[PDB]
DNA sequence: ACAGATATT
């Protein structure tokens, strides 16, 4: 069941270690793919995962990311607004997303309106990137054609002003 | 056989304007004992009998409210005693004008007294003072009858007859007590606080000797506005933001400058990326061109607040100076009443006549003549309030007969009136959207079509741009040097007088005639200083006062407390709430606050010890 | 030495 589960998660786009899957594995030895997807999605990604992104993803000399990939948001900042205001309507909303895979970190820029990732999105929310996605000057480009927001729930973001 | 009739108006101007209308020319010149009023006679019939009319004026507010002579001395009364243990009496304002005895000697006839005073709360106060003065001397009522009547009017041209016959009601003591309660509250709330502060700070700090520290329901929040802007200006950290600007060459050397669709980027690497996607690319396409007709809407009718704001901002005159100049102009008869909050014109207004009067001045002659020939647009509908008509010119004026600040204010008043009567501005807003890679830029321009009120206010004009090229989409304009500009956020500057007046009006602090007085008071008490473009920079005294107030029961400075007290006064006036109960409740609440303040003053003391 | 608000002609 381990091999078929690993293949199913690979197809679905989740890259989780064997120990992470076993931790996400429920009491029965029988594991349902949707059930483990839900359980893992509820948990923080830094504990469970595997090395997906290249070690130099934050240096610019990659320029491409291929295949499905699940990533965890950690901090969202509105670049087009001052740090004091953070909600001014004097600029189109551009979001800088600090994404993690559990081992390294990458930074992504909105580059277009999403209507699915907002400044109220809690850290721990997970996003799936599908198809080829562009990297320029060490920044991921997040158009609406590849970012799918899976509704996450993690206990962070307790204090906000 | 003839029965005497008495009538009282507020100023002898209204006395003339009412007698000449209600008497059909039969008047008299009977200058009174005081030497400042007039008595007018007439013959009529209000209750089916020949009655000899009599009509006079009580100029200004008759009696003021002040403490007894024992408690006015600063060194003999404990300030707290001013809250509840201090009697208060109604003295006669400007006693050299013996108004009370004038009224008493003129009042000898019964069966008729009416009240042609202002139709506001001030008018109710004045009228009940007049009735108090006049009843003890008038003739006794014979059996059951009504002797006291009141007339209500918003104009004195032809409504006066209908008011004289039908609209003969009674005065409203409930609303006439609201102003008395306000006076008593304000006097007791001040006086005591300022006396305590003055006797405390004049015996502890040398540099404050022979200086007055004043607290009031309107002065202190006014200072607090400037102090909070000072807190914001000294509690701001500049932030660096990068704006990407690129230019294109349209035909030969037009050098069209564009601005980025995303107006700013508060990051360095992101801005460098967005430059790297645009720098090395040499062409630029166009995606959308939009030509839209838009209208810059005409100004409303002038009121005192907007007049003061414009005098402070554009003309360069203080609020008290502007108010004094307006009062002087009204006294000479050039303009109308200058303290009015009515941005709406009355239905029966001679707009054509007022505009035709200003048809022989070499600054507005052509515009006024063309406007009268073509037609006049109806003025914008505004917020009427019933307190006198808006400020409008009433007589032709020229540089020779008045000069300086008087002319500089008259010019603005006349131009505002003409602009209100004139047409509306129209301009083409042409926006062109360029694409210089995976990046969008835009360029906007304005082109006037029919200058309306712009022709009479050449400071609301649309700036002259050099037009935009007619692009048909799919162009291939060459680009220039796409540069990443580095900029810093600018800290806010100190409050201007116009902004302070706007805050006063928004929060209800002060009235149409007390805003300049409050601003001048905070300026002369060495709390704020006027600097550059009429900016009110707070001084050390203002900073320490407002900060200490924030530390010590911080609700004596917030603008909301004055609004709450005013709501209580309105509840008094309408009738829902009583008078003595609310008087005592507010007095005791603020007495508790003052007792807290007196023993908590150590915070303000230690906050002042850092300064002088 | 005071509040605020108003102020003929
Ligand atoms: Mn009045």
């Amino acid at each position: 069941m381990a091999q078929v589960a690993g293949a199913a998660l690979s197809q679905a786009g989740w890259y989780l270690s064997d120990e992470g899957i076993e931790a996400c594995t429920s009491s029965p030895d029988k594991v349902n793919v949707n059930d483990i997807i839900l359980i893992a999605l509820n948990t923080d990604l830094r504990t469970i995962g595997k090395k997906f992104l290249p070690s130099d993803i934050n240096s610019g000399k990659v320029e491409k990311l291929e295949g499905p990939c699940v990533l965890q948001i950690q901090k969202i900042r509105n670049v087009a607004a001052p740090k004091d205001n953070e909600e001014s309507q004097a600029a189109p909303r551009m979001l800088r997303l600090q994404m993690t895979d559990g081992h390294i970190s990458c930074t992504a820029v909105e580059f277009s309106y999403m209507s699915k990732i907002s400044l109220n999105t809690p850290p721990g929310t997970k996003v799936k990137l599908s198809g080829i996605v562009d990297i320029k000057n060490g920044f991921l480009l997040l158009n609406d054609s590849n970012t799918t927001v899976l509704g996450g729930e993690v206990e962070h973001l307790i204090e906000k002003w | 056989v003839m029965k005497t009739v008495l009538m009282v108006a507020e100023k002898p101007s209204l006395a003339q304007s009412i007698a000449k209308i209600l008497s059909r020319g039969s008047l008299s010149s009977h200058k009174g004992l005081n030497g400042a009023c007039s008595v007018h006679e007439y013959t009529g019939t209000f209750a089916g009998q020949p009655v000899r009319f009599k009509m006079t004026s009580v100029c200004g507010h008759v009696m003021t409210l002040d403490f007894l002579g024992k408690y006015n001395k600063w060194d003999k009364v404990d300030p707290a005693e001013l809250f509840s243990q201090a009697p208060t009496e109604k003295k006669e304002a400007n006693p050299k004008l013996n108004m009370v005895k004038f009224l008493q000697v003129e009042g000898r006839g019964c069966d008729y007294i009416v009240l042609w005073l202002d139709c506001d709360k001030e008018g109710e106060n004045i009228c009940f003072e007049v009735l108090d003065a006049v009843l003890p001397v008038m003739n006794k009522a014979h059996g059951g009858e009504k002797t006291v009547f009141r007339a209500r009017f918003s104009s004195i041209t032809d409504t006066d007859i209908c008011n004289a016959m039908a609209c003969l009601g009674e005065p409203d003591h409930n609303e006439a007590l609201s102003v008395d309660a306000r006076q008593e509250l304000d006097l007791r709330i001040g006086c005591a606080f300022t006396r305590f502060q003055t006797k405390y700070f004049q015996g502890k700090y040398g540099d404050l000797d022979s200086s007055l520290i004043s607290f009031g329901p309107c002065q202190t929040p006014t200072l607090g506005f400037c102090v909070e802007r000072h807190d914001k200006i000294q509690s701001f950290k500049p932030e660096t933001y990068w704006v990407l600007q690129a230019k294109v060459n349209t035909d030969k050397d037009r050098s069209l400058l564009l601005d980025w669709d995303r107006v700013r980027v508060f990051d360095r690497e992101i801005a460098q990326m967005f430059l790297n996607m645009t720098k090395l690319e040499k062409e630029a396409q166009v995606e959308a061109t939009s030509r839209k007709e838009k209208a810059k809407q005409r100004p409303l009718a002038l009121n005192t607040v907007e007049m003061l704001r414009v005098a402070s901002s554009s003309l360069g005159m203080g609020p008290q100076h502007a108010m004094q100049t307006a009062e002087r102009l009204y006294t000479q008869g050039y303009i109308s009443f200058p303290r009015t909050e009515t941005t709406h014109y009355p239905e029966n207004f001679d707009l054509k006549g007022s505009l035709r009067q200003q048809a022989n001045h070499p600054y507005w002659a052509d515009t006024v003549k063309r406007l009268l020939a073509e037609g006049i647009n109806r003025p914008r509908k505004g917020h009427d309030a019933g307190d006198h008509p808006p400020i409008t010119p009433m007589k032709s004026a020229t540089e020779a007969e008045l000069g300086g600040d008087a002319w500089r204010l008259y010019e603005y008043i006349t131009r505002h009136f003409i602009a209100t009567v004139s047409h509306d501005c129209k301009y083409l807003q042409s926006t062109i959207s360029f694409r210089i890679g995976p990046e969008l830029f835009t360029c906007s321009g304005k082109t006037v079509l029919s200058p309306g009120f712009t022709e009479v206010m050449p400071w609301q004009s649309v700036p002259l741009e050099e037009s935009l090229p007619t692009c048909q989409r799919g162009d291939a304009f060459p680009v220039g040097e796409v540069k990443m500009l580095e900029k810093q956020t600018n800290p806010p500057d100190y409050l201007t007088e116009a902004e302070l007046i706007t805050l006063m009006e928004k929060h209800g602090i002060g009235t149409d005639a007390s805003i300049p007085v409050h601003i001048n008071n905070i300026c002369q008490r060495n709390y704020v200083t006027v600097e550059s473009g009429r900016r009110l920079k707070p001084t050390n005294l203002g900073i320490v006062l407002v900060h200490g107030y924030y530390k010590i029961d911080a609700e004596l400075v917030l603008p909301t407390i004055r609004s709450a007290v005013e709501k209580q006064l309105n509840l008094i006036a309408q009738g829902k709430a009583d008078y003595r109960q609310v008087l005592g409740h507010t007095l005791d609440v603020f007495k508790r606050k003052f007792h807290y303040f007196v023993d908590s003053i150590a915070g303000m003391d230690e906050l002042m010890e850092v300064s002088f």
Side-chain angles (χ1 to χ4, degrees):
Chain A
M1 187 66 204
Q3 297 298 109
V4 58
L9 277 296
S10 66
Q11 293 327 288
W14 293 66
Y15 275 8
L16 281 53
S17 67
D18 47 355
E19 290 291 327
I21 292 167
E22 196 48 53
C24 176
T25 292
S26 66
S27 158
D29 293 357
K30 292 177 70 68
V31 285
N32 219 10
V33 176
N34 48 309
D35 168 70
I36 59 175
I37 281 295
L38 294 174
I39 294 298
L41 192 173
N42 210 12
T43 71
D44 162 79
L45 183 63
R46 281 192 301 272
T47 300
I48 56 181
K50 192 171 47 180
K51 265 292 305 195
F52 181 76
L53 283 79
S55 161
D56 56 355
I57 193 68
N58 210 2
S59 43
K61 64 182 181 293
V62 286
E63 296 289 327
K64 277 74 69 177
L65 181 50
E66 75 274 15
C69 169
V70 298
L71 292 174
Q72 192 183 218
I73 310 179
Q74 276 195 190
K75 292 182 183 293
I76 282 175
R77 195 212 180 284
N78 186 9
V79 170
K83 182 175 174 66
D84 182 73
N85 206 279
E86 288 291 328
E87 214 63 42
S88 199
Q89 274 70 237
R93 172 178 60 67
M94 186 183 338
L95 291 180
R96 164 175 78 182
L97 296 95
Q98 305 275 113
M99 290 207 191
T100 185
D101 63 358
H103 307 290
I104 61 171
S105 162
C106 58
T107 309
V109 59
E110 208 179 357
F111 196 63
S112 287
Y113 207 98
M114 307 277 95
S115 69
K116 297 292 184 182
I117 288 293
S118 179
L119 195 61
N120 290 22
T121 319
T125 318
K126 291 184 180 44
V127 298
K128 183 178 184 293
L129 312 180
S130 57
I132 55 170
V133 61
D134 292 331
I135 309 156
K136 292 181 181 180
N137 295 113
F139 277 71
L140 270 291
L141 277 296
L142 293 183
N143 53 2
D144 211 319
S145 66
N146 46 24
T147 70
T148 49
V149 190
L150 296 94
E153 185 51 58
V154 181
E155 51 269 12
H156 312 356
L157 205 74
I158 304 103
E159 190 277 331
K160 170 185 320 183
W161 177 231
Chain B
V1 183
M2 73 291 291
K3 178 63 73 177
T4 318
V5 164
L6 188 153
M7 296 203 206
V8 169
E10 197 150 280
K11 326 153 182 306
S13 302
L14 276 74
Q16 286 289 110
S17 283
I18 278 179
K20 79 166 189 284
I21 301 299
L22 288 178
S23 289
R24 289 294 91 200
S26 63
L27 300 191
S28 173
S29 171
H30 182 254
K31 275 270 172 193
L33 294 174
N34 52 25
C37 295
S38 70
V39 176
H40 296 171
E41 293 82 3
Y42 174 66
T43 78
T45 297
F46 64 91
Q49 61 181 357
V51 289
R52 174 191 211 71
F53 274 29
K54 190 186 288 185
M55 202 285 267
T56 184
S57 179
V58 298
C59 64
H61 228 74
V62 182
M63 281 166 138
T64 61
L65 183 63
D66 181 65
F67 286 99
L68 266 295
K70 203 261 194 198
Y71 289 153
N72 264 329
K73 296 157 121 172
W74 280 24
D75 315 281
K76 276 262 301 193
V77 61
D78 209 7
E81 308 189 9
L82 296 201
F83 278 153
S84 294
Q85 283 134 10
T88 312
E89 82 185 0
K90 291 206 141 174
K91 293 187 286 185
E92 177 172 1
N94 55 23
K96 291 166 158 36
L97 194 46
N98 189 359
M99 209 87 68
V100 177
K101 189 37 171 40
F102 170 50
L103 281 161
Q104 275 201 338
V105 75
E106 271 308 273
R108 294 298 169 158
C110 60
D111 199 19
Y112 208 97
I113 181 171
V114 295
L115 282 183
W116 297 80
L117 302 171
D118 304 346
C119 279
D120 55 355
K121 187 172 65 175
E122 283 326 299
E124 313 304 331
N125 204 17
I126 297 170
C127 74
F128 264 112
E129 299 191 306
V130 169
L131 276 295
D132 166 356
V134 75
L135 272 295
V137 65
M138 288 177 30
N139 207 303
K140 162 185 57 62
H142 178 73
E145 51 205 40
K146 35 181 174 66
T147 66
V148 175
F149 304 71
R150 164 70 182 270
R152 321 274 285 165
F153 56 87
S154 73
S155 66
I156 51 175
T157 178
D158 215 348
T159 318
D160 293 333
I161 46 170
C162 82
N163 296 115
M165 283 74 75
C167 179
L168 279 194
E170 281 56 32
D172 58 357
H173 206 311
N174 291 319
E175 163 190 353
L177 286 179
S178 177
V179 59
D180 183 27
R182 173 182 66 70
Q183 268 188 355
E184 195 161 8
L185 266 73
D186 186 74
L187 169 67
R188 279 188 199 266
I189 295 285
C191 295
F193 264 97
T194 185
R195 280 197 204 159
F196 170 61
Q197 280 179 107
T198 312
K199 296 183 290 294
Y200 187 52
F201 286 157
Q202 281 183 354
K204 200 162 271 280
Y205 299 92
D207 291 331
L208 281 175
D209 70 312
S210 178
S211 299
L212 196 144
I213 319 291
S214 65
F215 170 82
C218 310
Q219 182 175 182
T220 300
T222 292
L223 178 63
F225 285 135
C226 314
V227 175
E228 66 183 1
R229 189 150 281 255
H230 177 96
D231 283 327
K232 294 181 176 67
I233 190 167
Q234 293 179 356
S235 297
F236 187 32
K237 293 179 185 66
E239 293 179 353
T240 74
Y241 64 93
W242 296 258
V243 186
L244 182 50
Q245 193 168 315
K247 296 183 290 294
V248 292
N249 304 337
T250 77
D251 194 1
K252 181 266 290 181
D253 277 323
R254 275 222 71 221
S255 164
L256 191 43
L257 60 94
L258 318 171
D259 63 358
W260 204 7
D261 217 0
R262 295 136 190 176
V263 298
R264 38 200 194 190
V265 164
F266 286 65
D267 200 355
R268 180 84 168 279
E269 293 83 3
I270 289 182
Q272 178 69 19
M273 182 179 72
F274 282 143
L275 187 153
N276 266 320
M277 314 205 294
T278 318
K279 184 183 47 180
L280 73 165
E281 190 276 331
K282 272 79 69 177
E283 291 46 50
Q285 313 192 3
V286 64
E287 65 183 1
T289 80
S290 66
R291 275 161 300 94
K292 291 177 70 68
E293 293 179 353
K294 285 182 31 193
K296 202 194 288 298
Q297 203 203 0
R298 331 176 304 255
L300 283 155
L302 205 45
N303 54 355
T304 187
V305 168
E306 209 276 336
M307 182 179 72
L308 288 172
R309 298 218 317 267
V310 161
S312 296
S313 282
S314 70
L315 284 193
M317 283 193 327
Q320 208 198 18
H321 202 151
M323 190 57 56
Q324 276 181 0
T325 302
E327 283 291 330
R328 186 268 187 189
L329 279 177
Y330 164 64
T331 300
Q332 278 181 351
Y334 281 160
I335 66 172
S336 70
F337 195 69
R339 29 165 187 278
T340 78
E341 71 281 5
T342 300
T343 71
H344 186 80
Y345 283 120
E347 200 269 303
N348 47 13
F349 207 75
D350 50 355
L351 277 188
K352 283 183 178 67
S354 285
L355 205 63
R356 187 169 310 117
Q357 274 153 42
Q358 288 312 335
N360 285 127
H361 196 282
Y363 292 166
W364 318 299
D366 291 331
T367 302
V368 158
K369 190 253 290 180
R370 181 198 321 253
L371 205 52
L372 294 174
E374 296 290 328
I376 62 170
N377 296 115
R378 286 182 186 170
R380 288 172 64 190
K381 277 74 69 177
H383 167 270
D384 195 358
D387 181 65
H388 318 344
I391 314 166
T392 48
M394 299 297 240
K395 205 205 311 304
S396 189
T398 318
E399 271 285 350
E401 41 186 300
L402 73 164
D405 296 359
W407 180 249
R408 287 170 79 233
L409 189 78
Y410 182 85
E411 266 200 359
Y412 173 70
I413 286 172
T414 286
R415 289 183 142 134
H416 205 112
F417 172 77
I418 297 177
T420 303
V421 176
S422 194
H423 295 285
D424 199 83
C425 196
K426 286 193 186 297
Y427 57 86
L428 267 194
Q429 173 84 100
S430 68
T431 61
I432 186 167
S433 296
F434 283 88
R435 176 180 287 285
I436 298 169
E439 278 300 326
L440 281 69
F441 302 84
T442 186
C443 182
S444 298
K446 295 173 153 136
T447 297
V448 289
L449 261 177
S450 162
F453 68 102
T454 300
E455 209 200 9
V456 296
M457 321 185 88
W459 60 83
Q460 303 214 18
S461 186
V462 176
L464 183 63
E465 287 91 5
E466 55 182 1
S467 175
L468 277 296
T470 61
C471 299
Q472 209 158 0
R473 174 201 191 81
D475 277 31
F477 279 157
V479 306
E481 186 201 17
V482 189
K483 280 203 311 302
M484 182 184 42
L485 294 176
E486 186 144 347
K487 285 153 152 267
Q488 313 263 19
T489 318
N490 292 108
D493 204 358
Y494 291 123
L495 284 173
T496 45
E497 308 214 61
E499 284 171 270
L500 194 66
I501 293 177
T502 305
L503 287 176
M504 301 215 168
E505 183 68 33
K506 208 173 91 72
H507 282 126
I509 288 174
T511 59
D512 46 353
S514 79
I515 286 167
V517 189
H518 299 333
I519 292 177
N520 200 265
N521 275 343
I522 75 161
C523 288
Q524 65 182 357
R525 296 290 185 269
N526 290 318
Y527 290 173
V528 303
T529 65
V530 292
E531 284 197 331
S532 80
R534 309 307 299 197
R535 302 175 307 163
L536 294 159
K537 166 197 202 56
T539 198
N540 273 329
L541 199 45
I543 305 313
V544 67
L545 275 166
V546 170
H547 279 178
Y549 283 148
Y550 276 145
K551 297 169 42 68
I552 297 169
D553 186 74
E555 59 159 315
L556 73 165
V557 176
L558 294 174
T560 61
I561 186 54
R562 182 67 178 171
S563 296
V565 175
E566 196 272 331
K567 297 296 289 183
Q568 280 302 288
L569 296 166
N570 286 322
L571 265 290
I572 297 169
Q574 285 176 353
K576 293 179 179 179
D578 203 13
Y579 167 71
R580 296 295 296 165
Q581 189 66 42
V582 61
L583 198 44
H585 184 244
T586 308
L587 279 194
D588 273 18
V589 158
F590 265 104
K591 165 191 297 284
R592 293 202 329 264
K593 292 178 187 301
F594 183 50
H595 279 321
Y596 185 45
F597 184 86
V598 161
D599 71 28
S600 289
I601 193 66
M604 191 175 306
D605 206 355
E606 63 91 20
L607 190 63
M608 187 95 88
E609 90 186 3
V610 59
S611 76
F612 47 83

